[PDB]
Design a protein around this nucleic acid. Structure first.
Ligand SMILES: [Ca+2]
Ligand SMILES: [Ca+2]
Ligand SMILES: [Mg+2]
Ligand SMILES: [Mg+2]
Ligand SMILES: [Mg+2]
Ligand SMILES: [Mg+2]
Ligand SMILES: [Mg+2]
Ligand SMILES: [Mg+2]
Ligand SMILES: [Mg+2]
Ligand SMILES: [Mg+2]
Ligand SMILES: [Mg+2]
Ligand SMILES: [Mg+2]
Ligand SMILES: [Mg+2]
Ligand SMILES: [Mg+2]
Ligand SMILES: [Mg+2]
Ligand SMILES: [Mg+2]
Ligand SMILES: [Mg+2]
Ligand SMILES: [Mg+2]
Ligand SMILES: [Mg+2]
Ligand SMILES: [Mg+2]
Ligand SMILES: [Mg+2]
Ligand SMILES: [Mg+2]
Ligand SMILES: [Mg+2]
Ligand SMILES: [Mg+2]
Ligand SMILES: [Mg+2]
Ligand SMILES: [Mg+2]
Ligand SMILES: [Mg+2]
Ligand SMILES: [Mg+2]
Ligand SMILES: [Mg+2]
Ligand SMILES: [Mg+2]
Ligand SMILES: [Mg+2]
Ligand SMILES: [Mg+2]
Ligand SMILES: [Mg+2]
Ligand SMILES: [Mg+2]
Ligand SMILES: [Mg+2]
Ligand SMILES: [Mg+2]
Ligand SMILES: [Mg+2]
Ligand SMILES: [Mg+2]
Ligand SMILES: [Mg+2]
Ligand SMILES: [Mg+2]
Ligand SMILES: [Mg+2]
Ligand SMILES: [Mg+2]
Ligand SMILES: [Mg+2]
Ligand SMILES: [Mg+2]
Ligand SMILES: [Mg+2]
Ligand SMILES: [Mg+2]
Ligand SMILES: [Mg+2]
Ligand SMILES: [Mg+2]
Ligand SMILES: [Mg+2]
Ligand SMILES: [Mg+2]
Ligand SMILES: [Mg+2]
Ligand SMILES: [Mg+2]
Ligand SMILES: [Mg+2]
Ligand SMILES: [Mg+2]
Ligand SMILES: [Mg+2]
Ligand SMILES: [Mg+2]
Ligand SMILES: [Mg+2]
Ligand SMILES: [Mg+2]
Ligand SMILES: [Mg+2]
Ligand SMILES: [Mg+2]
Ligand SMILES: [Mg+2]
Ligand SMILES: [Mg+2]
Ligand SMILES: [Mg+2]
Ligand SMILES: [Mg+2]
Ligand SMILES: [Mg+2]
Ligand SMILES: [Mg+2]
Ligand SMILES: [Mg+2]
Ligand SMILES: [Mg+2]
Ligand SMILES: [Mg+2]
Ligand SMILES: [Mg+2]
Ligand SMILES: [Mg+2]
Lengths: 117, 69, 98, 142, 63
RNA sequence: GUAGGGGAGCGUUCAGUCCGCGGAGAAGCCAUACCGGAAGGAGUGGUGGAGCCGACUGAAGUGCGGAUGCCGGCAUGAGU
RNA sequence: GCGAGAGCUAACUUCCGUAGCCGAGAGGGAAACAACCCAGACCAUCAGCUAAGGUCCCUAAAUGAUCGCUCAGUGGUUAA
RNA sequence: AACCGAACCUGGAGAUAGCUAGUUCUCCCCGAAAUGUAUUGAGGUACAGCCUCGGAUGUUGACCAUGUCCUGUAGAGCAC
RNA sequence: AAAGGUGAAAAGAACCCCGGGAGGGGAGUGAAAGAGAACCUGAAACCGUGGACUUACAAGCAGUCAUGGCACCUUAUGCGUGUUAUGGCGUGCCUAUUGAAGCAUGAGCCGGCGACUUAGACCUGACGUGCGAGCUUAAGUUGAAAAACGGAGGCGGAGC
């Protein structure tokens, strides 16, 4: 019994090719560059996911001291003074509190400063 | 009995090694190691310096009895 | 405003059905109790432990299984290419509490 | 999940460089351009302000406004580096010196080139952007 | 098929026993010898060790 | 985690047995946001116009990106 | 890196010993950078703490506090 | 008879090739070596050494402490 | 060397239209001309026409992740789909190597062909079955829509 490759290879190739949407040029049309681009793209997808965690970390922080200094203290002497205010621990995305309710972020500034005295 | 439902004893047939055929195992170089005289093959049980040649004490015949302990 | 502090469940203030990591006990009406970490009511803020005594009731809605991803991984010149599937379970919970 | 804003607003301010150390006036203006004073809201968008630098001519400089500050530009032609306008000389056109400092502290990508638009340097005491009434920043931080 | 390597047979390597490979003791054959009288005698019958698998298939049918 | 050893498996053709499907439409082809831990598998629609799926067992010419690999088609250089 | 020979007490030299790394080691730092510093990646999270290394703006984080030192851009290139 | 230090064709013939290149489906478990001897040996092999699988045994393994013996380097010294 | 296929049946397209023709458009036949003789299916590379979203201060292994914009709504109003602008990050693949983005090998692209096999009463192990102190046949004979018979001989059983 002979068992030629037919239908198998086209199906595999077409699944690779379909992963290529708006890939530029022969990235979208030739199988070999499509598959090769996907190897490097693997690298990027995994690394980036882990990194995106750390990137939103950064955006968080960068808003929080901007509001903090608007109230006359930096990030450092703030997220300290909430933690030194101990039970105050809300921590996760204080960014949004600073970015939408300033009546609240002002009270948190007063709390941190009271804790540092 | 159902021939659909015949089943060989588990463990009595194992599958052949399919050497080649992926990076899911046994990639590129087959079972083999890389370079070297491992390639289309030959040469037997021989070390190709000096094969432990010990001397020879010899007598050709024999004939032995059938045993009934 | 209200959001899971995605370490597990603890949160601030305001009521709206939302996703979370799985909650063990199922069906509905888990009524799962929630402990305040912040509140803004009447825009009258109360926070940290003082607010934490405040309750937040919330019923369980549905168990789920969020959208699929692939864990695919690659290294160079070494034949290291591996592909696997993954899918995270979750738990809708409808906010309701004080 | 995280809040991102409009683009709706543009806010102007005059910085007085008169007697300030350059370089420190530099980072002050560069941050007010980047948008780090309001919450950075989003990196993608230039939420930063328009800045008007007046009395740019009188910027102070320490150690050597001579001798030290050798600004340099390369021309594309062989022998085209020997273009080292340096020093006090560029305070014959002061608005560029300040404008160079700030530009080295904005990022080099497509936003930064666009952010260059938001710096408005006038060497004299006066500025003509009266129409967008800017009001003032000033000295130092905390 | 499968030959025995007849270089194994009347040569040392008796196959015999609990499956282990005896061999002889070698130096001072009938090449010249002054040397000791307690070595000229201690050349009777040795038995090798970590090569046996090679020796066996030289002569697995015990000729 | 490289050579290497071990484990469990996906898909292709052929064969035996079963369950069946097909001109009110089969394989093949084409699109797709569904499913499975992967190899993969289904749903629906378009095309086609005569054969074919699923399950269990068996046997293999059984899985390609490379080989200045082969055959064929078509491009670039260029309206030069 | 340490201990030695050969070498000019040269070499990203060569040859032994010894520990660690790369080889097959991703991640953070060292501008870039196999070997150096921190640390060994089962999968997911728009949660928290630290290590090396950092906290003027590119660029996450004290234009930090207290004593001094250097007015050379020393910092940011050897010596008799 | 358009390539003559030994023509062309067919055959042995799939010459031989310690040399180059290539060797394709998937996830899981473990995980090396570039050392030592020998070699018409040095980019090849044989046996060790390091990997894995299965069986047997069953802490015999690992650091660390105490006890005990062995040693002529660092340093030092000038008694050869 | 390459080699193939209208349709069940030639019923193989009278007649008309543009054209020297070639080619086509109708009318007819036929279930179908979505079969018309460059005659089953008709993938891919390659060439085009139309549409959506886009692009003429931009430095770029061609992606990836994040967010805004504009379309769209048949596994589909969502944790959607397509496409964009902008930020962050980001040194093709293989081979060969102490060490490859390498200015080191290979490759224009796509399709198909393309490499660990077979053999032998041969050795040596793992797993599984039958019979077990014993196990088994070879050549062949006779029967074959099927398999039985056939102890010659082979392996244990004694070693030095
Ligand atoms: Ca022309
Ligand atoms: Ca030309
Ligand atoms: Mg990345
Ligand atoms: Mg934080
Ligand atoms: Mg086999
Ligand atoms: Mg395997
Ligand atoms: Mg090779
Ligand atoms: Mg060969
Ligand atoms: Mg031989
Ligand atoms: Mg010799
Ligand atoms: Mg790479
Ligand atoms: Mg490598
Ligand atoms: Mg004997
Ligand atoms: Mg149909
Ligand atoms: Mg499909
Ligand atoms: Mg028909
Ligand atoms: Mg084959
Ligand atoms: Mg390959
Ligand atoms: Mg090819
Ligand atoms: Mg060709
Ligand atoms: Mg010397
Ligand atoms: Mg060296
Ligand atoms: Mg190597
Ligand atoms: Mg390592
Ligand atoms: Mg690393
Ligand atoms: Mg690194
Ligand atoms: Mg870096
Ligand atoms: Mg460096
Ligand atoms: Mg280096
Ligand atoms: Mg690396
Ligand atoms: Mg911390
Ligand atoms: Mg530290
Ligand atoms: Mg900062
Ligand atoms: Mg200071
Ligand atoms: Mg001639
Ligand atoms: Mg001719
Ligand atoms: Mg000749
Ligand atoms: Mg040949
Ligand atoms: Mg021959
Ligand atoms: Mg020869
Ligand atoms: Mg491991
Ligand atoms: Mg010797
Ligand atoms: Mg060697
Ligand atoms: Mg060995
Ligand atoms: Mg074991
Ligand atoms: Mg022991
Ligand atoms: Mg012990
Ligand atoms: Mg000394
Ligand atoms: Mg016909
Ligand atoms: Mg015509
Ligand atoms: Mg005509
Ligand atoms: Mg009709
Ligand atoms: Mg037609
Ligand atoms: Mg047709
Ligand atoms: Mg025609
Ligand atoms: Mg037909
Ligand atoms: Mg056709
Ligand atoms: Mg067109
Ligand atoms: Mg177009
Ligand atoms: Mg321009
Ligand atoms: Mg533009
Ligand atoms: Mg260009
Ligand atoms: Mg982009
Ligand atoms: Mg080299
Ligand atoms: Mg490199
Ligand atoms: Mg190149
Ligand atoms: Mg190259
Ligand atoms: Mg080479
Ligand atoms: Mg080339
Ligand atoms: Mg036999
Ligand atoms: Mg025979």
């Amino acid at each position: 019994p002979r068992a030629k490759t037919g239908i198998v290879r086209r199906r595999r190739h077409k699944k690779v090719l379909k992963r290529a949407k708006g890939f530029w040029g022969s990235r979208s049309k030739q199988y070999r560059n499509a598959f090769q681009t996907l190897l490097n793209a693997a690298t990027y997808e995994y690394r980036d996911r882990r990194n995106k965690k750390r990137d939103f970390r950064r955006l968080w922080i960068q808003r929080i001291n901007a509001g903090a200094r608007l109230h006359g203290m930096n990030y450092s002497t703030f997220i300290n003074g909430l933690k030194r205010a101990n039970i105050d621990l809300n921590r996760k995305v204080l960014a949004d509190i600073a970015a939408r309710e300033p009546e609240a972020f002002k009270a948190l500034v007063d709390a941190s400063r009271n804790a540092r005295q | 009995m159902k021939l659909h439902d015949l089943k060989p004893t588990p463990g009595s047939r194992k599958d052949r090694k399919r050497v080649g055929r992926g990076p899911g195992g046994t990639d590129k170089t087959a079972g083999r190691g890389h370079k070297g005289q491992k390639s289309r093959s030959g040469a037997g049980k021989g070390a190709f310096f000096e094969g432990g040649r010990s001397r020879l004490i010899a007598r050709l015949p024999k004939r032995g009895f059938n045993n009934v302990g | 405003m209200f959001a899971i502090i995605q370490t597990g469940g603890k949160q601030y203030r305001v009521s709206e059905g939302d996703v979370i990591r799985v909650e063990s006990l199922q069906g509905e009406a888990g009524d799962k109790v929630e402990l305040k970490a912040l509140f803004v009511g009447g825009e009258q803020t109360v926070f940290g432990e003082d607010a934490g005594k405040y309750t937040v009731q919330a019923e369980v809605v549905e168990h789920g299984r969020g959208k699929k991803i692939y864990i695919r991984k690659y290294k160079s010149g070494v034949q290291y290419r591996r592909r696997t599937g993954h899918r995270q379970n979750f738990t809708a919970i409808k906010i309701l509490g004080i | 999940k995280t809040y991102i804003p409009k683009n709706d607003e543009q806010n102007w301010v005059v910085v007085d460089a008169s007697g300030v150390p350059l370089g420190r006036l530099a980072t002050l203006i560069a941050s007010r351009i980047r948008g780090k004073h309001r919450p950075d809201f989003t990196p993608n968008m230039i939420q930063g302000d328009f800045v008007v630098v007046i009395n740019a001519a009188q910027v102070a400089l320490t150690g050597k406004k001579l001798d030290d500050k050798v600004y340099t530009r390369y021309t594309g032609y062989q022998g085209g580096l020997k273009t080292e306008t340096a020093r006090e000389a560029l305070s014959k056109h002061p608005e560029r010196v300040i404008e160079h400092a700030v530009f080295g502290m904005l990022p080099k990508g497509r936003q930064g080139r666009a952010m260059h638009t938001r710096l408005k340097v006038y060497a004299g005491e006066t500025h003509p952007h009266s129409a967008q009434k800017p009001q003032v920043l000033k000295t130092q931080p905390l | 098929p499968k030959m025995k390597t007849h270089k194994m047979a009347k040569r040392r390597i008796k196959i015999t026993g609990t499956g282990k490979v005896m061999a002889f003791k070698s130096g001072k054959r009938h090449q010249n010898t002054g040397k000791s009288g307690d070595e000229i005698r201690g050349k009777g019958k040795g038995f090798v060790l970590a090569k046996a698998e090679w020796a066996r298939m030289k002569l697995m049918l015990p000729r």
